[PDB]
């Protein structure tokens, strides 16, 4: 008598995370008249 029994398996996992934040700010200002300390402020 002869007997054989066998099994095999393959498995995977993956995970990801990602983030991207982007920003722009601009300001433009003009003042005329006044005194330079407060006009500066």
């Amino acid at each position: 008598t002869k007997v054989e029994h066998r099994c095999t398996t393959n498995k995977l996992s993956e995970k990801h995370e990602g983030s991207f934040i982007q920003g722009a700010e601009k300001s433009i200002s003009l003042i005329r008249g006044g005194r330079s300390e407060y006009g500066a402020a």
């Binding site: 099994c7 393959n10 498995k11 996992s13 990801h16 990602g18 700010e25 200002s29 006009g39």
Partner: protein, 49 residues
């Protein structure tokens, strides 16, 4: 001349065509940023009996 940007009288030369203390202030701001992040994970398994 009386100024007013500093609150003081001053004396001009007789030559100068005009001297004036009106203020002008001009400001320009530009700010630009980006932040990026990536994360990755992998797992693999293989088996026999």
């Amino acid at each position: 001349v009386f100024s007013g940007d500093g609150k003081d009288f001053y004396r001009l030369s007789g030559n100068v065509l005009s001297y004036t203390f009106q203020v002008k202030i001009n400001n320009d701001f530009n700010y630009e940023f980006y932040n990026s992040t990536w994360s990755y994970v992998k797992h693999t398994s293989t088996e026999h009996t």
